């Protein structure tokens, strides 16, 4: 009888068992669905795991994934294939998310985040930095990146959920299709009829004028856009906050030091899990050896990067929040995965901590932190609520 994955922990907590992981041969656990897997957790393995063309994301034999939600994960975007396949559909959103074109954003990341601070402080504190700033900024950077207007935003706030819910059924799942189809359909044809200079209209462009694409693939690029691209940077929002807020010093290393806010989001991205469950399982496509074990061809390793993130021999004192550190963490993935959004979250964290240090320099915690609400079922781990105050 196996190891059941993923572990218990409450919030942002990282759990013992690793320790006793770390120091022993590569483990076989079961999952809350699906076939058992591997557990990648050293930093070299979880590297291998995202990166090796001996590990595919496909089920290509048989397989039934390895996961924590009800109805299996597929579909026809980037999370779907192998290179070169893979790269080729990615190569169409791909000049859009370079940090040439990211860092071109900055002011209006900025722009947005100022307003979210305006409309938090004018409600007074305490307040819910969530409702305030966590989720409206993060939504309308992509809204507004590939033309969803605000009134629509709710619409996919509830189609992310869906995905990202442990209890969402193939139903669900069809319902979430169905609709966003119908939604991304509407939008394809305003656009055929009013081309627009945003991203659904590069996308049209992309399918009707040089045909590099088709439309079940232009709906699905939108699709990973639209679900991974604003609850990620919400929760990681709070989270960041309730690190620094939970130390004595709470904001004042980064006011005292703002040049230093670029490393501390590098640092609360190692330090942070930001997932409860895991990402997508990977298949070896051959036989090989991985921390004293033979993965025979077929079998299923999970990617942990919240382990691969405290590796005892790459980070001395790993579970050291040090704001100061400085070996590149697994937070954003690696290889052909690694995420497309990766600049855009950065400057979104950047940017935020610029402008709660320089706006809110005493800014802490608006209730006591044991009162703290975790949320429970979700992908990811992160606060329903967020009271701070000034
Ligand atoms: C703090 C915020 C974020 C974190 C921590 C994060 C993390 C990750 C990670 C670890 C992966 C790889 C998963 C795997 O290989 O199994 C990934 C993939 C991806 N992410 Fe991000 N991400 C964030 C924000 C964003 C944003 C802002 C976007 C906006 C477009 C985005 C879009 C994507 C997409 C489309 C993929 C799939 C890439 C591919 O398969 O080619 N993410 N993300
Ligand atoms: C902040 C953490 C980041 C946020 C990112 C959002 C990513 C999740 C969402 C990414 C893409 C998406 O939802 N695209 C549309 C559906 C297509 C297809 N069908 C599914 O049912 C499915 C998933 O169900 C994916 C779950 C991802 C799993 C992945 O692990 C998450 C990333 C995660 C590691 C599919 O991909
Ligand atoms: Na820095």
Redesign the pocket.
């Given at each position: 009888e196996l190891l059941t994955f993923p572990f218990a922990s409450t919030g942002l907590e990282f759990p013992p068992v690793y320790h006793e992981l770390y120091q022993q041969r590569l483990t076989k656990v079961r999952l809350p669905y699906g076939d058992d897997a591997y557990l990648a957790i050293r930093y070299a393995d979880v590297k291998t795991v995202?990166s090796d063309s001996r590990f595919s994301?496909v089920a290509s034999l048989g397989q039934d994934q390895p996961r924590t939600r009800a109805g299996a994960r597929v579909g026809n975007?980037?999370?779907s294939?192998d290179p070169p396949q893979?790269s080729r559909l990615?190569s169409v959103?791909g000049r859009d998310?370079t940090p040439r074109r990211v860092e071109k954003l900055r002011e209006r990341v900025r722009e947005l985040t100022d307003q979210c601070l305006d409309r938090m402080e004018a409600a007074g504190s305490p307040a819910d930095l969530v409702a305030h700033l966590a989720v409206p900024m993060?939504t309308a950077?992509?809204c507004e990146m590939m033309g969803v207007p605000e009134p629509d935003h709710h619409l996919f706030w509830g189609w992310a959920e869906t995905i990202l819910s442990n209890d969402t059924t193939p139903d669900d799942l069809i319902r979430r299709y169905q609709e966003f189809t119908a939604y991304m359909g509407a939008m394809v044809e305003e656009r055929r009829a009013r081309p627009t200079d945003d991203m659904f209209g590069m996308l049209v462009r992309a399918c009707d004028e040089e045909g590099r694409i088709t439309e079940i693939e232009m709906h699905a690029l939108a699709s990973?856009?639209l679900?991974?691209?604003?609850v990620?940077?919400a929760?990681?929002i709070a989270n960041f906050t309730a690190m620094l807020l939970a130390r004595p010093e709470r904001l004042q290393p980064l006011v005292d030091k703002p040049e230093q806010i670029p490393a501390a989001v590098e640092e609360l991205?190692r330090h942070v899990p930001?997932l409860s469950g895991f990402?997508?399982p990977r298949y070896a496509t051959e036989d090989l050896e991985m921390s004293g074990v033979t993965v025979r061809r077929g079998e299923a390793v999970i990617?942990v990067?919240a382990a691969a993130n405290r590796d005892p021999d790459v980070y001395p004192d790993a579970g050291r929040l040090d704001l100061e550190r400085n070996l590149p963490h697994?937070?954003?993935?690696?290889?052909?995965?690694?995420?497309?959004?990766?600049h855009?979250?950065r400057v979104?964290?950047q940017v935020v901590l610029e402008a709660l240090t320089e706006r809110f320099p005493d800014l802490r915690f608006g209730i006591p932190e044991n009162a703290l609400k975790w949320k429970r079922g979700h992908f990811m781990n992160g606060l329903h609520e967020l009271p701070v105050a000034w």
């Open positions: 995202l994301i975007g980037l999370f294939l893979h990615r959103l998310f993060p950077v992509v990973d856009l679900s991974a691209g604003f990620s940077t929760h990681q991205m930001i990402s997508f990617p990067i697994l937070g954003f993935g690696q290889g052909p995965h690694f995420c497309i959004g990766a855009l979250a979104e964290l």
